[PDB]
Point group: C2
Chain length 402, copies 2
Amino acid sequence: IEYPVLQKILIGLILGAIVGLILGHYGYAHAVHTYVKPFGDLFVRLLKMLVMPIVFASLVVGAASISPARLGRVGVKIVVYYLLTSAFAVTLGIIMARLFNPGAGIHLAVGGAPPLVHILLDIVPTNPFGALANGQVLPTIFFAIILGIAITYLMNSENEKVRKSAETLLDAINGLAEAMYKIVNGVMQYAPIGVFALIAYVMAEQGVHVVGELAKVTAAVYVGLTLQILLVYFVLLKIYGIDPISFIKHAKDAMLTAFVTRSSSGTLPVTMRVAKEMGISEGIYSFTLPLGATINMDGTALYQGVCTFFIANALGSHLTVGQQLTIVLTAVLASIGTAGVPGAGAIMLAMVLHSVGLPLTDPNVAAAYAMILGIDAILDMGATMVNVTGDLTGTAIVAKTE
Amino acid sequence: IEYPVLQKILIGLILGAIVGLILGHYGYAHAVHTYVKPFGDLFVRLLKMLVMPIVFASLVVGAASISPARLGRVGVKIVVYYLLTSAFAVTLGIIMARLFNPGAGIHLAVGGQQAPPLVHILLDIVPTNPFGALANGQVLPTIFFAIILGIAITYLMNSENEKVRKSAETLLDAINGLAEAMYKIVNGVMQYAPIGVFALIAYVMAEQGVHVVGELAKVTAAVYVGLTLQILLVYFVLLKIYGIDPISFIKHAKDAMLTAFVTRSSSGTLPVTMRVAKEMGISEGIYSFTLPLGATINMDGTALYQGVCTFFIANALGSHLTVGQQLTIVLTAVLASIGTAGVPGAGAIMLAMVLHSVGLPLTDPNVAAAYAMILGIDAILDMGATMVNVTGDLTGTAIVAKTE
């Protein structure tokens, strides 16, 4: 139950990727799935477990921070933060989708409803207890904020049974909040097993596919986001003090979980614990790391920039070069929010085709789309890991302001 | 309601193929479907209409032929006929699938590397209610009844009673009244065949023509010339070798092939297919039992389409395909549905079913990807495969006929 720290993770990752990529090439991809996968799950399981308490609890406490600003500000900022990162991510994806040209081997050309208001009203839960119980991040967010603001106001009550109990609750809640961070490390001790087993399977069952013209989308994603980290985030970390390499130092574990869990929200326990140990206050990170996981577009903007190209160019089309954006922007904007779920990228890509006019019925549209689906998991890992890097970057910059 | 004969069809076919292929390239493939298709259907409608009477009626009469042999023989022959044509079709498909090599642009490899009873389909041949049989479609149980009825009528005529010998005639005549009546309609329909043909391969070229491009087109080559080579090298070799004049055959079988190609439906063309065997001069005692039992037992098409398409997939997922061990898979495909190859789109189904057997299931999103390309070209690869099946049906008939 001992041994080296987060190199033990990197020992799992590289050793897994190799043993999986090998094992699926020799076809046992299924056998890997029935023997290895469940240790990879048990990791995501234990992380998921925490996500609800660790968010709800932390954010009642995170409304002990100055309410009118802080939770009125920052929200204004971190929104405008993602605007100016997603903007850069879009043009970094398009200019990666021209650079690499994934549409040469195919080459096979075939011709050719959200209300918002009834999703805005969904933010406000009608039963917070249910909210928590039955998953749900973004209504639990809204409650916790409204609770901790209410508690704040109870402490300034001239009565002192009230001022009394007010404390009791908030403390007891912080008991939980803290308790969970304690577990998040208990889990992390199983993270090398979890990582090894996860990208063992994910490399067996979709690695072999990363070959040929399919691989030419994986290039423009993986180096396209590698360039989002270096050229857009570090440029923003450099320009706001906080030291770029000391950042990766601290954010090591949240990125290696985001990459492997492939789930933005499913890593928030680790994501948040890195912001504690980094030294941001709960009053910021408890509201910008969850509202990040669901509002962050850096990933989808960069994956449906190069994948949008791949399809438009594989059915042998111009793609209105430089009018890529018209489609890529409209994709992001169709689900500005709720990009946290794994596999979500594939869904919007399909949904865009409904808008493009090329419906998934056209058996060659469906053919090209199915190739992306044999590679989506690899393209999802990188997109989430660059999302949760972008989440902390957004946090640590706004934090070191307000 | 007048004008030139079957050139009017060829005027529809070439003019349609051009106007459709053009119209779908400019995207109106849907608009072609909502305006043109329904005149193309109305042709297949009217033909379908006849298929039940014209088979049932014709085959009761076709048991006026000498029963113990003729319907005991020929059946033995025409079975063994298709054995030796399908054998040749298999090796003509494989040796077309190597010749053209459809698996170069993809090239996109995914690992892997990895139920019919028959007896409960044999017992389905015997209907349990002939009336229903007829009513609710069903060719191959209506076949079995009609044969059993006309044999029974034959035996009633040799009855020493002469009310019996009397009514026996009445029925069989009245039935031949129908049988004939239908051939009369089959020309009434044919006068609408140029409109039908134009409208059908107008749409079929709009909605799947544009796809016949690149590596997809390299399967259409090895099908269309692969079956063009079945006609010339296998059927004419058998027509030459059995008297019946090869070019005088196409003369007579012109209309049955241009319907089979455009209706894409083996059984859906039997009215025309049969009328060509009347006007060719075979007896009902043969053609009424070898053209329907053909439409459902003929494999010349599927053997040649799932020879080159089986390759395309095995080779597009970048596999050896065990060259020369193609047959192992191609034979087992044909043999999985020896029968019931008559339905349109059937070829696609077995191709999928083979992958279940190969070990590469349709779930594997690149298996499903390559398969989906074939599905964007299936209709074009179906027209040719049915037209060469119904050419092989009449060839089988006219050769066995000119024997027994």
